[PDB]
Amino acid sequence: VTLADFMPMSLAEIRSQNTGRLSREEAQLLHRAAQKEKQNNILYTARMLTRANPLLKKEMRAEKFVAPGAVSSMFSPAGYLTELYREARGLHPKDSDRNLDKRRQDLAKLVLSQDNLDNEISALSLANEQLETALMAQTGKTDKNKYYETLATSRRSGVTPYNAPFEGIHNALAQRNFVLPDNILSNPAKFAILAAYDAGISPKLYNILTEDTESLTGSDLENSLKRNFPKVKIKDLMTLDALANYYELPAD
Amino acid sequence: EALSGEYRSLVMNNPVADRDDIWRNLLVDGKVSAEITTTLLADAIAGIQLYINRTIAGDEPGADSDALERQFFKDWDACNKRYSTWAGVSQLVYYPENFVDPTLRTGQTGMMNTMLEQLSQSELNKDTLENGFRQYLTAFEQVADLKVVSGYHDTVNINQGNTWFIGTSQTEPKKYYWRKADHSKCQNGRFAANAWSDWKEITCAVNPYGDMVRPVIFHSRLYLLWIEKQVQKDNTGKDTASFTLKLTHVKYDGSWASPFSYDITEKNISGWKKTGLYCAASQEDNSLLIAWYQIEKETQPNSFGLHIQPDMSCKKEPNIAGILATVTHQLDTETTVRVNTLLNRISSFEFTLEKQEGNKEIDLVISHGDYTVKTENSISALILNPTAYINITPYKLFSDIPIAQVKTISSDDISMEIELNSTKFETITGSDVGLRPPLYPTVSRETLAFPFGKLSITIPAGADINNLDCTIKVRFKNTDVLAATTTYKLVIKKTDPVQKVISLYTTPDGAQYMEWDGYRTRLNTLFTRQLIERANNGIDAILSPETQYLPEPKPGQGTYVTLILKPYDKNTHGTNRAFTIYYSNDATGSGKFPVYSGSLSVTDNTEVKLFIPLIKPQDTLYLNATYQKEATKQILLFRTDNNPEGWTLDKSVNNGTFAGLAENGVTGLLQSGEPMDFSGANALYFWELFYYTPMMVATRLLQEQNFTEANRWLSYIWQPAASGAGDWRVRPLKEDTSWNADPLDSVDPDAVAQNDPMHYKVSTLMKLLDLLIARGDKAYRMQERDTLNEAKMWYMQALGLLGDKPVSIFSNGWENPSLSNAADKTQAKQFHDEISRIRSGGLLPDVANTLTGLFRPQQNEKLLGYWQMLEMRLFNLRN
Amino acid sequence: RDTLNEAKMWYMQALGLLGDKPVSIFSNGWENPSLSNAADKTQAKQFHDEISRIRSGGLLPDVANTLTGLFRPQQNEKLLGYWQMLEMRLFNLRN
Amino acid sequence: LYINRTIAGDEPGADSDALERQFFKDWDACNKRYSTWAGVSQLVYYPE
Amino acid sequence: ELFYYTPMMVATRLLQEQNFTEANRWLSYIWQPAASGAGDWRVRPLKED
Amino acid sequence: TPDGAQYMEWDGYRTRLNTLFTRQLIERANNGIDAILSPETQYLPEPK
Amino acid sequence: NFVDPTLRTGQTGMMNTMLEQLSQSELNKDTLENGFRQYLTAFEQVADLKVVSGYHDTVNINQGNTWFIGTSQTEPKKYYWRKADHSKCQNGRFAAN
Amino acid sequence: DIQALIAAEITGRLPTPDVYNDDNKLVIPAINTGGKITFSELAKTQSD
Amino acid sequence: YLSSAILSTSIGVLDMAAAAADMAPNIFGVAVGGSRWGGIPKAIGAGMSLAASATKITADNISQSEAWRRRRQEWEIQKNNAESEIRQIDAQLEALA
Amino acid sequence: YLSSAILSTSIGVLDMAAAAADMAPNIFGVAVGGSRWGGIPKAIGAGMS
């Protein structure tokens, strides 16, 4: 109890707290006592656990041993993750935005199980879920397909005017080696839009690339910059790193 | 891609930012393809590992620096960074036998190494393997013949520090060696076996006279020193003798320097008789006070002194008769030999840590680094630590260039002002240090330093030095906007701890012992004088367990007492299940020495054996016991004759009962020869001879496939008995004897196995399993029929060693916890609280559910590999 | 698999040491000079005159345009090789 | 199999004095297998 | 030599023959990353150029 | 100088020839390589 | 780009004889500590050197060279020699080369 | 292979698809220390 | 090689006894003396050099045994090559049948 | 091999101390002397070899 709390703390942690109470030498003596008591306690439990070894059962606390690879083990990845989260969750203060508990609200909620340790999931799908659960919480909508419908028209990045239905059409229809504007069954007066869908262009992106932005002066220029760039500062976008990252192409 | 863009378009409010910034900020990699799959806990592990690496390299500002100066993060990169090297290090405490190696051991002596050199060839017949063992036994005889000549204790309190010894060999000429005895592992007067260094040969040529050799420590370097006599002849018909002091020392690579020379003889030492020298360090005016002195029944009628600088130049002291009068409890007599300690500071300093701290945001911590006095003044050396952390108000908090305070220049900011008895002297770091600790690292809790290099404070004027040199205060002052001062009181005073004598003796039948405060410690051993008759019969008689039961004489005058104690009572033992047990002389009130401490047991008598020495010059003795209830009464042990064994059986008028022994039997008096000790000073050599040499030869014959001789060498240690239990032929494996008190100060499975020798049992059993599976595979590859039945009987013998395959439970009391719930700080505090309670025997366990905490222990994966290996071999046999 | 995540965390630590990849300018104040104009003796005399002035602290710089003369300094090719090497390793990791 | 199980302690009740015998003291080296029984017993009758 | 070139020689000698976890220790006698963004140089004339 | 250092004294200058680092490494080096290459060893003083 | 921690001009004999001993393949902690302690022994010996006497080259002591003779702290003594180049000595301050 | 069956019967979903269907009762196992299986049963009142 | 190493280590005892016997004076009479004051360090140096020669001999012994073990491993590889080639030629004979 | 090299270098110290001890005379009395004037170059040659 007394020296048990001072075991995970460092010397600078012990000296950091109770500055008026503890001196500089007493903190060092207390640190040495706590570390040696931690060593002797773990030697004591290793001495009681090595008596249950099946090569010594003829010469004889055998409560519970688990298999290698079980989630209950002290050498499991669950135990490593518990050690790691316990040493990690106090590095930044709880006010800070760089704290582990604030930037990831799924780790304190996270359950340790044999299923979580064994089952394989797609890491990309987990990244997608991690972004969806933040974006839908920002917009307040709880539905998923309603959010992709309101994402179908939006222009607020260089990657945003896309339709997941249209990308599904384009991928499935190009996987048949099928070419839309080269049919016998088409309107020849609608070859342009059909070829734009053939190259693969969302209809909102077609409405972007359709605009007569050249020779456009007055307040309509301000309206067009407000529409085609809703969220960015244009003065922040002028640099080359912003134009590389905003449209997701390399700066070279 | 689209969601990653729209995130910082909306959440981060910075669409300029990189996509890799979402992996730096959000700890989930985004540009991964759709085919890379992971488990969920491994993705959380990789995310928190990325978080630790980015906050340990400075890419995450605002981190707690004190949490990063921690043994988890100080050992991050070597051990804790990866799952593999976390598991492989954490298993090294619980399963050392997976990583033990009978070939490579830390602390392995030169004899074992030069035997392993000779067994490293391929053809290992009986002749090579016997000649190597006889050469090893020769070297073992030489290091066991060593009688300790003289010594030097490090510090002044002999409960602490170190003790170097100088041991000579039983040859002509003599080969002087040296050990080191670490008193920091010496509790209750009982050295742990790792508190001893090995012997190590002093390679220089040393030719003393009158057995005058003393080691001495000068700034943590062993110096050897002796007086060499040279027989000469005068120009006339007479013949003189020139005496010469010599002084060598170790170098860093273990070599020994060339000895120096100093002319001694001035008309008096040639006329002395039976004389001897004295050498010791000095904490004041650092030198080596060398002193050779005439002997009588009383010490030192005449003496002559000499100082040795770090320049190693002579400096003749004109008076040591005033000096040795303060030392003469360490100087020898005509019949005693006394190991010396360093000379004391004539004045010792003390510092009162507080009067008034002033402003409490900065702790204002000084630390008195060095402190001496010169011939006329008192010098000091100081460093100064402020806090200098966050929430200095108001804020920006943008940038610092190293209405508000002075964020800029910290010139002349801190200043020490010692007060003398009437005057004062204010120095300042603007007058000292051009090195200027900047407030940037502005990130919180970063503390600073202010070193004062060798502040020589002049001058104590008109003070009685040192009678009433209690001088009033010593004060520093950090003067800045919002900074303060705190002051300290020197408590300096001359001291003299009088006559804490430490000495060497030899009993007339062979043994030696170092006799200090209330204890004796056997230095040498007489096993080498009695192996000589056993070893003529061969290796089979050397490694027999009757050789390990060989006696050894008792050190000096003293008695053995073996005490049987009652099982635990809540009433008469207090609440503590542990105990400690003392003895004294005893003119009552003269203090009593702790000779043993231990944890008494429930439902079982505990038998504790002792050796109570006779130091005090009806030679009485008395014994006590201390419980949580109270302390016990004394029990007399006298003798009427000079017979050594007799110490009257349950002696006079006092009843002879502590209230905790609960027997009519106390005695244990007789058998002067105790058995040989494998926890004493000579422990490593005995453990090598009786365990590590058969282990090395057995693992060396398992390699290169000499199985029928490897099984013989494994049968020197373990041999199966008619009962179900095995018969252990190495004594401390039959009597499980810890010989390493502090194993976790280094990364080695050997020390952990030395703390609990059951891992040596499991190492031996795993080597025998390796042997049996290797013999079975050699018989299996000879694919004929009778040799296949041979293979089956070998694998069935290996399964007989292993036994019943342990069924791994899966239906368990393991709930599926939250990671927040699994990593609570209370969950480790309560764990170590309960184990630290039960280890001291604070009371009984509640009865006995959670001995491991949250995470259950697992089986050894190597042994389970043996199970699956034998099952596959025998399945292929049966088909 | 876990050793591939180990590989990714090591290469990300190396990228953390290097930092931000320096964008090589191409639109520049570099005119296209004549080789007669590029190799004038006055063009090195004035260069070493100005640097020998500022090294002795003869006065302040005018403020600070041409510290290298006519030819601009270049990045270290070995370090740019580390950039491309880490980028290729991490591209193979992400696929 | 019977000799190995009664020499290793897996058969309780064995006569210990019969196990302290030169047939069983030299069990593992010589007498355990047919090959190293025959090859040792022939060494007296055919040393050449 | 003692404070820079000997750890450099041992570190580049352990990078060869692939003793990485000891090579990083010998490189950590000279350079070691700090809590601030700047590195911490443990050889004095590299801290004081 | 009587505490150990040497210096060549010419026209208006002095130049320290030797050093006393070797008399004070001896206590630091017993603790090992980690105490030798520590930056506190590099801050070690030297007489004027 | 062209520095080599193995090969340096002006590299002392102590560094060379340490690099000899670290040129094997098996570099455990024991080899790599014994080589460092032997290096530190040689470093101690070249740092113990007190200068006995000297000889200046020219007559103007602002120019020329100065040879020195330094003895070791052993018995017998091992005399060594340096050279102090005054052509790199401005303001009474020798450069380290 | 029988321990996996008993484990999947207590904590998994076996017998598939419906359990609890012997006179509104149920018997579920509970193993301990690797060498015993103890039982505990369920019942209910008559709603619906 | 092992006998040579043991001869080269069992020799410093008697080489030390030589220097022990040299310490007594041998010129007697009026002129007295003749001891060899450096004989014992010469004996310890001969012991060190001779132990160095012995450990170099046993290092060469270990090197020969390891070279022979690698030779046997190469023979095992060549044996398994020819032994698989027999099985391949036998299957090829069965295909020809 | 490395231990043999270190034994073959840690030996000239003591071989030099031998020649140091030889410099003192050993024939005393009326006839005086017996020093070994070439002992120190023999020691330095043994050290070099």
Short mmCIF file of C-alpha atoms in Angstrom, two decimals, chain A residues 1-2 4-5 7-13 15-16 19-20 23-24 31 35-51 53-61 63-93 96-100 103-104 107-114 116-124 126-128 130-132 134-135 138 147-148 151 154 156-157 159-160 162 231-232 236-237 239 241-242 245-248, chain B residues 1-11 15-19 22 24-30 32-34 36-41 43-45 48-49 51-52 55 60-64 66-70 72-73 76 80-83 86-87 90-91 93-95 97 360 365 367 383 385 445 724-726 728 738 742-744 755-756 758-759 761-762 765-766 769 801-804 806 808-810 812-814 816-820 822-825 829 832-833 835-836 838-839 848-849 851-852 855-859 861 863-864:
data_model
loop_
_atom_site.label_atom_id
_atom_site.label_comp_id
_atom_site.label_asym_id
_atom_site.label_seq_id
_atom_site.Cartn_x
_atom_site.Cartn_y
_atom_site.Cartn_z
CA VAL A 1 0.00 0.00 0.00
CA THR A 2 2.67 2.45 1.12
CA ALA A 4 2.96 -0.33 -3.68
CA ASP A 5 1.69 2.88 -5.29
CA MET A 7 6.23 1.09 -7.97
CA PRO A 8 5.12 2.27 -11.46
CA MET A 9 6.20 5.85 -10.78
CA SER A 10 9.67 6.96 -11.79
CA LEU A 11 12.15 8.88 -9.67
CA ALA A 12 11.14 12.12 -11.37
CA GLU A 13 7.48 11.21 -10.82
CA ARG A 15 10.12 13.84 -6.81
CA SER A 16 7.46 15.72 -8.80
CA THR A 19 7.39 18.72 -3.22
CA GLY A 20 6.93 20.22 0.23
CA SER A 23 12.84 15.94 -0.01
CA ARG A 24 15.24 15.12 -2.83
CA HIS A 31 12.22 4.94 -5.11
CA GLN A 35 11.70 -0.91 -6.97
CA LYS A 36 13.41 -3.52 -4.79
CA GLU A 37 10.08 -4.47 -3.22
CA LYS A 38 8.58 -4.82 -6.70
CA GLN A 39 11.46 -7.12 -7.68
CA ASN A 40 11.06 -9.24 -4.55
CA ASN A 41 7.28 -9.50 -5.01
CA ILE A 42 7.62 -10.69 -8.57
CA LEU A 43 10.32 -13.16 -7.48
CA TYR A 44 7.92 -14.44 -4.83
CA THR A 45 5.13 -15.01 -7.31
CA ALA A 46 7.56 -16.60 -9.78
CA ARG A 47 8.71 -18.94 -7.01
CA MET A 48 5.16 -20.01 -6.22
CA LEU A 49 4.34 -20.40 -9.91
CA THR A 50 7.35 -22.57 -10.73
CA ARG A 51 6.32 -25.24 -8.23
CA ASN A 53 5.68 -27.30 -13.30
CA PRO A 54 4.65 -30.76 -14.64
CA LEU A 55 8.25 -31.96 -14.55
CA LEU A 56 8.10 -31.52 -10.76
CA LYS A 57 4.67 -33.00 -10.00
CA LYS A 58 6.31 -36.17 -8.67
CA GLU A 59 8.21 -34.12 -6.07
CA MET A 60 5.14 -32.34 -4.68
CA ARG A 61 -0.02 -23.66 -6.45
CA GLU A 63 -4.56 -22.96 -9.67
CA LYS A 64 -4.97 -22.09 -13.37
CA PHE A 65 -2.60 -22.35 -16.30
CA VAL A 66 -3.76 -21.35 -19.77
CA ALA A 67 -2.64 -22.35 -23.24
CA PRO A 68 -0.04 -20.44 -25.24
CA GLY A 69 -1.96 -18.04 -27.43
CA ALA A 70 -4.89 -17.72 -25.05
CA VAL A 71 -6.17 -14.22 -24.38
CA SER A 72 -6.07 -14.84 -20.62
CA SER A 73 -2.29 -15.33 -20.63
CA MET A 74 0.19 -12.91 -19.12
CA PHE A 75 2.27 -13.19 -22.29
CA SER A 76 -0.64 -12.68 -24.67
CA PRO A 77 -0.97 -9.67 -26.94
CA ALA A 78 -3.86 -8.69 -24.68
CA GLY A 79 -1.46 -8.47 -21.74
CA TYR A 80 1.03 -6.53 -23.86
CA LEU A 81 -1.74 -4.16 -24.95
CA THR A 82 -2.83 -3.74 -21.33
CA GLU A 83 0.73 -2.91 -20.27
CA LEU A 84 1.08 -0.55 -23.23
CA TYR A 85 -2.21 1.29 -22.69
CA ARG A 86 -1.51 1.57 -18.96
CA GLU A 87 1.88 3.14 -19.57
CA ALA A 88 0.53 5.26 -22.44
CA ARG A 89 -2.69 6.82 -21.16
CA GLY A 90 -0.99 9.38 -18.90
CA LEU A 91 1.58 10.96 -21.18
CA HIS A 92 -0.48 13.93 -22.23
CA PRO A 93 -2.92 15.69 -19.87
CA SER A 96 -4.83 18.23 -24.21
CA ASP A 97 -5.93 17.29 -27.71
CA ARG A 98 -2.90 15.01 -28.05
CA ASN A 99 -4.05 12.73 -25.24
CA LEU A 100 -4.57 9.10 -26.19
CA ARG A 103 -8.11 11.19 -29.88
CA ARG A 104 -9.25 7.53 -29.67
CA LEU A 107 -9.60 2.09 -26.66
CA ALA A 108 -11.10 2.63 -23.21
CA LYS A 109 -14.29 1.04 -24.53
CA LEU A 110 -12.32 -1.85 -26.02
CA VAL A 111 -13.07 -5.37 -24.78
CA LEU A 112 -10.35 -8.01 -24.46
CA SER A 113 -11.57 -11.35 -25.78
CA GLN A 114 -10.33 -14.41 -27.60
CA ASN A 116 -10.76 -9.92 -30.75
CA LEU A 117 -7.36 -11.58 -30.50
CA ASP A 118 -7.98 -14.29 -33.10
CA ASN A 119 -10.36 -12.98 -35.76
CA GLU A 120 -9.04 -11.15 -38.80
CA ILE A 121 -10.67 -8.03 -40.19
CA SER A 122 -9.81 -5.75 -43.08
CA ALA A 123 -7.67 -2.90 -41.77
CA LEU A 124 -8.96 -0.59 -44.49
CA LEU A 126 -11.57 -0.41 -39.86
CA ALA A 127 -10.07 2.88 -41.06
CA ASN A 128 -13.27 3.62 -42.99
CA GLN A 130 -13.12 5.10 -37.79
CA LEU A 131 -13.61 8.01 -40.20
CA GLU A 132 -17.36 7.45 -40.64
CA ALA A 134 -16.36 10.91 -36.67
CA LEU A 135 -17.91 12.47 -39.77
CA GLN A 138 -19.91 16.00 -36.81
CA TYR A 147 -24.56 10.60 -45.42
CA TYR A 148 -23.26 9.21 -48.70
CA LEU A 151 -21.66 13.41 -49.76
CA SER A 154 -20.48 18.07 -51.85
CA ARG A 156 -15.44 20.52 -49.97
CA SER A 157 -12.23 18.75 -51.03
CA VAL A 159 -11.79 14.13 -53.72
CA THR A 160 -15.33 14.85 -52.47
CA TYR A 162 -18.03 11.48 -56.01
CA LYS A 231 -14.44 25.45 -46.74
CA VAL A 232 -10.87 26.44 -47.62
CA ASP A 236 -4.11 29.28 -47.53
CA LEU A 237 -4.50 27.16 -50.67
CA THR A 239 1.04 27.36 -51.57
CA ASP A 241 1.86 21.86 -50.41
CA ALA A 242 -1.82 22.81 -50.08
CA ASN A 245 -2.58 17.65 -50.44
CA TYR A 246 -5.97 19.17 -51.24
CA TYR A 247 -6.22 17.41 -54.61
CA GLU A 248 -4.20 14.37 -53.42
CA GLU B 1 -9.48 8.66 -50.05
CA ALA B 2 -12.76 10.59 -50.06
CA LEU B 3 -13.45 10.25 -46.35
CA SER B 4 -9.84 11.07 -45.52
CA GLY B 5 -10.14 14.30 -47.48
CA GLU B 6 -13.50 15.25 -46.01
CA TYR B 7 -12.26 14.61 -42.45
CA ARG B 8 -9.77 17.47 -42.37
CA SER B 9 -12.12 19.42 -44.59
CA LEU B 10 -14.59 19.24 -41.68
CA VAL B 11 -13.12 17.85 -38.45
CA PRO B 15 -7.76 20.83 -45.76
CA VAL B 16 -4.15 21.87 -46.41
CA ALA B 17 -2.98 19.07 -44.10
CA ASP B 18 -1.38 15.86 -45.36
CA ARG B 19 -3.18 12.55 -45.47
CA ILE B 22 -4.52 11.67 -40.26
CA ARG B 24 -0.20 10.78 -37.15
CA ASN B 25 -3.30 12.23 -35.47
CA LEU B 26 -5.71 9.32 -35.57
CA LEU B 27 -3.35 6.31 -35.26
CA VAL B 28 -5.05 4.32 -38.04
CA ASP B 29 -3.27 3.98 -41.38
CA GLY B 30 -5.37 5.21 -44.27
CA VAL B 32 -3.58 0.66 -46.87
CA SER B 33 -4.94 -1.52 -49.66
CA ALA B 34 -8.06 -3.59 -49.15
CA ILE B 36 -3.98 -6.20 -45.94
CA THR B 37 -5.85 -7.79 -43.04
CA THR B 38 -5.08 -7.66 -39.31
CA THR B 39 -6.71 -8.65 -36.09
CA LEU B 40 -8.33 -5.94 -34.02
CA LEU B 41 -6.10 -6.12 -30.94
CA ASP B 43 -4.26 -2.91 -34.77
CA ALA B 44 -4.77 -1.34 -31.35
CA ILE B 45 -1.24 -2.49 -30.41
CA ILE B 48 -0.48 2.66 -29.38
CA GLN B 49 3.05 1.73 -30.50
CA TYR B 51 1.67 6.83 -30.33
CA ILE B 52 4.55 5.88 -28.02
CA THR B 55 5.61 10.95 -28.24
CA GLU B 60 3.97 14.96 -29.94
CA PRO B 61 4.53 18.17 -27.96
CA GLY B 62 3.17 18.49 -24.46
CA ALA B 63 4.21 15.08 -23.15
CA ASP B 64 4.89 14.39 -19.49
CA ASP B 66 8.70 12.42 -15.90
CA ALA B 67 6.49 9.63 -17.22
CA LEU B 68 9.02 9.19 -20.03
CA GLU B 69 11.94 8.84 -17.59
CA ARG B 70 10.49 5.50 -16.53
CA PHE B 72 9.13 1.00 -19.20
CA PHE B 73 10.28 3.78 -21.53
CA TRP B 76 11.55 0.88 -24.53
CA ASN B 80 9.30 -3.08 -24.60
CA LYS B 81 8.93 -1.78 -28.16
CA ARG B 82 7.88 -5.03 -29.83
CA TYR B 83 5.58 -7.84 -28.76
CA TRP B 86 8.44 -7.99 -24.57
CA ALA B 87 7.24 -11.57 -24.24
CA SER B 90 8.92 -11.23 -19.43
CA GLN B 91 9.19 -15.02 -19.77
CA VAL B 93 11.71 -14.44 -14.99
CA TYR B 94 9.02 -17.13 -14.99
CA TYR B 95 10.77 -19.69 -17.23
CA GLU B 97 15.17 -22.85 -18.15
CA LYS B 360 5.78 27.74 -3.52
CA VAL B 365 16.06 22.61 -4.20
CA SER B 367 21.92 19.56 -3.11
CA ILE B 383 23.69 22.69 -7.78
CA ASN B 385 16.97 22.88 -9.21
CA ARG B 445 7.54 20.01 -15.87
CA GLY B 724 7.93 -42.11 -7.67
CA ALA B 725 10.04 -39.05 -6.88
CA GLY B 726 13.43 -38.65 -8.51
CA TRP B 728 18.77 -35.73 -6.75
CA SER B 738 18.85 -20.02 -2.76
CA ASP B 742 19.26 -9.99 -6.05
CA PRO B 743 18.78 -11.64 -9.45
CA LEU B 744 16.63 -9.00 -11.15
CA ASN B 755 17.70 -17.56 -6.83
CA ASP B 756 15.39 -20.59 -7.13
CA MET B 758 14.08 -25.60 -9.08
CA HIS B 759 14.81 -24.13 -12.49
CA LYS B 761 15.94 -29.19 -11.82
CA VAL B 762 13.81 -28.32 -14.83
CA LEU B 765 15.10 -32.64 -16.85
CA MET B 766 14.86 -30.81 -20.17
CA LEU B 769 14.36 -35.08 -22.42
CA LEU B 801 9.30 -38.26 -17.48
CA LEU B 802 6.74 -35.74 -18.71
CA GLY B 803 3.70 -37.58 -17.39
CA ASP B 804 0.10 -36.46 -17.95
CA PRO B 806 -1.93 -30.73 -18.91
CA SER B 808 -5.52 -26.22 -20.99
CA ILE B 809 -8.69 -24.71 -19.55
CA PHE B 810 -10.80 -22.45 -21.73
CA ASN B 812 -12.64 -20.00 -17.09
CA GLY B 813 -13.29 -17.27 -14.57
CA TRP B 814 -11.81 -14.94 -17.21
CA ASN B 816 -13.94 -10.27 -21.06
CA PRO B 817 -12.86 -6.97 -19.49
CA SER B 818 -12.68 -3.43 -20.78
CA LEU B 819 -9.18 -2.25 -21.65
CA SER B 820 -9.85 0.71 -19.38
CA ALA B 822 -7.99 -4.11 -17.40
CA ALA B 823 -5.36 -1.39 -16.97
CA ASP B 824 -6.41 0.25 -13.72
CA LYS B 825 -3.63 1.50 -11.45
CA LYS B 829 -1.57 -1.50 -6.43
CA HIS B 832 1.46 -5.82 -5.03
CA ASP B 833 -0.14 -4.76 -1.74
CA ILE B 835 1.73 -10.01 -2.20
CA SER B 836 3.85 -7.64 -0.09
CA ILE B 838 1.75 -12.18 2.42
CA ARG B 839 5.51 -12.13 1.80
CA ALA B 848 -6.21 -17.90 -2.21
CA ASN B 849 -7.83 -17.03 -5.52
CA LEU B 851 -1.97 -15.04 -7.24
CA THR B 852 -1.21 -13.65 -10.71
CA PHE B 855 -3.81 -12.38 -16.46
CA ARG B 856 -3.46 -16.11 -15.84
CA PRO B 857 -0.05 -17.81 -16.12
CA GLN B 858 0.64 -20.01 -19.10
CA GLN B 859 2.43 -23.31 -19.62
CA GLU B 861 5.76 -23.46 -24.72
CA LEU B 863 7.68 -28.22 -22.79
CA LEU B 864 4.39 -28.30 -24.68
#
